[PDB]
Design an enzyme around this catalytic site. Structure first.
Site, short mmCIF file in Angstrom:
data_model
loop_
_atom_site.label_atom_id
_atom_site.label_comp_id
_atom_site.label_asym_id
_atom_site.label_seq_id
_atom_site.Cartn_x
_atom_site.Cartn_y
_atom_site.Cartn_z
N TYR A 43 9.65 11.06 10.06
CA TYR A 43 8.93 12.18 10.66
C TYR A 43 9.80 13.29 11.22
CZ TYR A 43 5.36 8.83 9.77
OH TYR A 43 4.56 7.94 9.10
N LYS A 55 6.99 17.32 9.32
CA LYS A 55 7.72 17.03 8.09
C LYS A 55 7.05 17.63 6.86
CE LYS A 55 5.98 12.63 6.21
NZ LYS A 55 5.74 13.19 4.84
N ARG A 89 -9.45 11.63 3.35
CA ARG A 89 -8.59 11.05 4.38
C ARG A 89 -9.05 9.66 4.76
NH1 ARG A 89 -3.90 9.52 5.98
NH2 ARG A 89 -3.31 10.19 8.09
N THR A 92 0.80 -1.21 0.00
CA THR A 92 0.00 0.00 0.00
C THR A 92 0.84 1.27 0.00
OG1 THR A 92 -0.35 -0.15 2.43
CG2 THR A 92 -2.09 -1.02 0.99
#
Ligand code: MG
Ligand code: MG
EC number: 4.2.3.6
Lengths: 354, 350
Positions: free
Chosen positions: A305, A232, A182, A96
């Site tokens: 991150y 980030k 989302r 994914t």
């Protein structure tokens, strides 16, 4: 604000961790490493197979890094499942994450999606060919209901990636768009349902607790990933869409107001997660709790991150939030910071030429 | 019981300024019959009669309720499209009412799917066999949405069989379940037949329509059917009833939350699509007003029983509901004997 809301970001993050009771686990480093290496080793051999190497178009280095980030996510958050289950989920969630690298228009390969599916003919889109061929290895660890949730969520994810190729934040005034998207690319029901292996949970006996977990975990998991990623993505001019950035465009508000909405939604979900399961089947609340803690530890330890940067900037500071944060960050590092050389080897590419 | 129900209906009908100028009597009838007729011959086939375990009387009523819904809301699509969609949405309404546990027949769902073997669950066996007749009307993206929404719906019915309204404090459960059994992306995507819309040219507009229409549609249906549910509530677990149980609020507060969402949803639907492609706006409006007409007229929603027990006022409320119920009845009230014939059973027997 050409300046990252460090003070604000620190406050929300700390409150989040308190709300969930971010703490220690009986999950030792030696155990983390055993699992990390185990999941990584099985997944690495899988992606190094010629068929996988052929249909899966991904830069070797990005594939190497995507796998390492997914094994960490799965081993850390799915602390209660078996090694095999960690390894199989590791492969699935790596597929994914990798689809996100594609820019190829799915349209032509989806023209006959249904008829091929119904007829049992291999799918034209190579991603689907690999993913569906491998799916049984993941689904064997679950019951019919949980399986259906994984299958649906992965189909939703495929559509989410299709939609994102358009780099569309939503039409100004399209308030429903941001969250609609989302949830499409979140894998919420995939994650939520994959936490319950039939080997240690009875789907039919815990149906209501599982279904509730799936519903609540969907929003917590994605909202937390959005919050933790907010650093980030702040100065990443390449990434033009995200839940927060789309709130800004679709709701016509400021980034601060969009961040506010995310922070309030995230805390309300944490508070309610605890309030609902802190008195249900013990094993269930255990899996749920280990997932929340693991997920956070993973965000804090994975360099993807870059949270080490925020830490390093407020490392020595007298404010309350800063100290609370660093203590938390330091905690995570104590059990989470592991050198890739202790588990992620040999490289996928190496096993590929063999 | 409440008469407040009138308030949170007038406010809606007023906001959208409900006016169904879709079709002419002759046209509605022509489509209602075409749609009904093809669906009726389909469900009367021996294979359908056998695998689909439904009481004839229920099948008959369900088919007529759906044909009405489809013809009244998908006003711009071809006759064939209405017919094929009526068949699909009739299958969904039938599953909604089923009580047979899915669990045992879903054990090998994926392996049978991947292998191309007929599914164990009879509903899937029929729906998937018939699906192409619906999908031929759409491009790949819209088709994917129909397929996903129908799969989600199947899971929704599974969950619904537990008559669970959610744990108190589970604020995310109510809407989680509603979207699951709402068929929002199926409706939202089935509005754009490739015959009159280009899926690539209007990708963004269609994607936006699916996102926004998913909530407007389900929320409007929840509001309109609040009467049909609270009344003979055979231990129902509706969106409103789940808001009460999960969010721990009065039935009033719940019903107030729904209407506010509906009003806001309507507001944004206009603000976004008004100045966009006119052909897109046209289809969206025809659905909204047509959908309302269908709720006001179709027996299933017993809004008639309310019309007659309210004829007693002349202000902006109570007299507004009756005023609207009349407008709808004029264009939408059609006697079944003019289109729904012959009965499915008659065709089945022969
Ligand atoms: Mg992004
Ligand atoms: Mg039902």
């Amino acid at each position: 604000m050409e300046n990252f809301p460090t003070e604000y970001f620190l406050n929300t993050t700390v409150r989040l961790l308190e709300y969930i009771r971010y703490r220690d686990s009986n999950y030792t480093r030696e155990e983390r490493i055993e699992n990390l290496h185990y999941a990584y080793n099985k997944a690495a051999h899988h992606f190094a197979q010629p068929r996988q190497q052929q249909l899966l178009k991904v830069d070797p280095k990005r594939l190497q890094a995507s796998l390492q980030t997914i094994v960490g996510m799965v081993v850390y958050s799915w602390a209660k499942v078996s090694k095999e289950c960690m390894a199989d989920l590791s492969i699935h969630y790596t597929y994914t994450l990798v689809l996100d690298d594609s820019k190829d228009d799915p349209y032509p390969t989806m023209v006959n999606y249904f008829d091929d599916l119904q007829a049992g003919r291999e799918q034209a889109h190579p991603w689907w060919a690999l993913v569906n061929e491998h799916f049984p290895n993941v689904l064997r660890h679950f019951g019919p209901f949980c399986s259906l949730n994984l299958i649906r969520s992965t189909l939703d994810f495929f559509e989410g990636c299709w939609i994102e190729q358009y780099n569309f934040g939503g039409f100004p005034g399209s308030h429903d768009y941001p969250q609609f998207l989302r949830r499409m690319n979140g894998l919420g029901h995939c994650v939520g349902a994959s936490l319950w292996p039939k080997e240690q949970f009875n789907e039919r006996s815990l149906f209501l607790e599982i279904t509730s977990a799936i519903a609540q975990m969907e929003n917590w998991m994605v909202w937390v990933n959005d919050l933790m990623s907010f650093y980030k993505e702040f100065d990443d001019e390449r990434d033009q869409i995200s839940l927060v950035k789309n709130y800004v465009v679709s709701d016509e508000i400021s980034l601060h107001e969009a961040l506010e909405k995310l922070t309030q939604d995230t805390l309300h979900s944490s508070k309610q997660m605890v309030a609902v399961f802190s008195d249900k089947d013990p094993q269930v609340m255990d899996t749920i709790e280990c997932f929340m803690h693991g997920f956070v530890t993973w965000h804090l330890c994975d360099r993807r991150y870059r949270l080490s940067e925020i830490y390093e900037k407020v490392k020595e500071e007298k404010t309350e939030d800063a100290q609370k944060f660093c203590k938390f960050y330091e905690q995570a590092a104590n059990v989470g910071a592991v050198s890739p050389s202790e588990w992620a080897y040999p490289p996928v590419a190496q096993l590929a030429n063999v």
